[PDB]
């Protein structure tokens, strides 16, 4: 498995929010009806809903 792509977020900003970070999507979206989901620390674990995805 090859390396991850990084993304960088600056501190104590005024936004406007939500502030964009990253975009990935399943190459099957032109093939099935798909939506995207997130879990880990920073959303479903503390600190909670710190990051969000658009499904």
């Amino acid at each position: 498995r090859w390396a991850p792509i990084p993304c960088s977020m600056l501190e104590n900003s005024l936004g406007p929010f939500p502030l964009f970070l990253q975009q990935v999507q399943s190459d099957t979206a032109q093939n099935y009806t798909i939506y995207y989901s997130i879990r880990g620390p920073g959303v479903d674990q503390e600190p909670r809903n710190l990051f969000y995805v658009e499904r």
């Binding site: 929010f17 939500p18 809903n49 969000y52 499904r55």
Partner: protein, 55 residues
């Protein structure tokens, strides 16, 4: 109506029902010209994503 209301506790679960919205149309009944479909167009505050509805 011009007012559609629900009340829920915090610390919830997906699929918690929050009632219904309704509409009626001055074209002839039993036709397309009065058949309906539904969607979400925004929230205040805009985030987090919290709700869903019957098409």
């Amino acid at each position: 109506e011009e007012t559609y209301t629900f009340t829920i506790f915090e610390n919830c679960r997906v699929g918690t029902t929050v009632g219904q919205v309704c509409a009626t149309d001055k074209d002839e009944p039993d036709t397309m010209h009065t058949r309906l479909k539904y969607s979400i167009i925004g929230q205040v505050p805009p985030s987090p994503t919290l709700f869903s509805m019957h098409p």
